[PDB]
Design a protein around this ligand. Structure first.
Ligand SMILES: [Zn+2]
Ligand SMILES: [Zn+2]
Ligand SMILES: [Zn+2]
Length: 85
DNA sequence: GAGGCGTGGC
DNA sequence: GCCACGCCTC
């Protein structure tokens, strides 16, 4: 009942604010700008900008508690964990 | 590993 | 509107 009434889009969202995020696919709007010296990258989604900053910093906050390997995202770790059993 | 994106608690 | 879990497809 939160329908994306742009053009012929068939999409509805269970949350007014997810529709707004989705509308950015039709407008190109990227409100989230990388502030890394001389970089210039921008994103439609804040969490995508977060993943980006992890390239720059090489921060990997997700540490496997069973080996040395670390990850930038939790899903990568979860997938890796399973490989341990 | 990486990008896109649906989602729900806050 | 943040943020982040997590799933999908490559
Ligand atoms: Zn749409
Ligand atoms: Zn950057
Ligand atoms: Zn491990």
């Amino acid at each position: 009942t939160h329908t994306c009434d742009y053009a012929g889009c068939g999409k509805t969202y269970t949350k007014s604010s997810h529709l707004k995020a989705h509308l950015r696919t039709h407008t190109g709007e990227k409100p989230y700008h990388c502030d890394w010296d001389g970089c210039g990258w921008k994103f439609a989604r804040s969490d995508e900008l977060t993943r980006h900053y992890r390239k720059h910093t090489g921060h990997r906050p997700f540490q496997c508690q069973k080996c040395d390997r670390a990850f930038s995202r939790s899903d990568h770790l979860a997938l890796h964990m399973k490989r341990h059993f």
